[PDB]
Amino acid sequence: GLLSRLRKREPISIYDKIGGHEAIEVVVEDFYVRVLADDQLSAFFSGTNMSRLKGKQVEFFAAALGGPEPYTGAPMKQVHQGRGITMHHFSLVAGHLADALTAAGVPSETITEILGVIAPLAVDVTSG
Numbered sequence: 134g135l136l137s138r139l140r141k142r143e144p145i146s147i148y149d150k151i152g153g154h155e156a157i158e159v160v161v162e163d164f165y166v167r168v169l170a171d172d173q174l175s176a177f178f179s180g181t182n183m184s185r186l187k188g189k190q191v192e193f194f195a196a197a198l199g200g201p202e203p204y205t206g207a208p209m210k211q212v213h214q215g216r217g218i219t220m221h222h223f224s225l226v227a228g229h230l231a232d233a234l235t236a237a238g239v240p241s242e243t244i245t246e247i248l249g250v251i252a253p254l255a256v257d258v259t260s261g
């Protein structure tokens with residue numbers, strides 16, 4: 134936990150500094166509200182079990198930012214490949230993530246840091 138890691142002189146992770154698991158859960162919920170209300174994106178998730186996705190994304194986002202959480206989903210390249218996702222789509226999704234972070238009160242500097250961890254994933258997520 135954060136306390137245990139601090140007693141062992143480990144640096145504070147992005148996960149811990151934005152409020153850990155509960156912060157990620159709040160942000161992911163908001164994020165998908167934003168994504169599904171965007172006409173340019175909603176169709177990608179037609180028929181997708183959103184309850185299930187949100188759970189995987191909470192795990193994935195937590196793990197990526199330094200949480201202890203198990204990621205239980207499939208690899209990014211295999212999940213997204215062939216879905217006709219372009220950098221324009223990727224960027225919109227990253228935009229909604231930034232907007233959810235802002236709405237949750239995450240300092241802009243830390244959102245930029247989070248996008249620096251996420252942006253590289255575009256190589257696996259896009260086909261365009």
Ligand code: HEM
Pocket residue numbers: 174177178180181182186189190193205206207208212213216218222223224226227251254258
């Ligand atoms: C920004 C970086 C992204 C991350 C970290 C991410 C993460 C994830 C995760 C964890 C899953 C769940 C995989 C599983 O079920 O095992 C997933 C699935 C999915 N993602 Fe993404 N994603 C990203 C970008 C995008 C974009 C840009 C789109 C479309 C514009 C997209 C559309 C989808 C779809 C359609 C699924 C599968 C839902 C289903 O199985 O029906 N993702 N993604």
Ligand SMILES: [C-]#N
Pocket residue numbers: 190
């Ligand atoms: C992908 N959400």
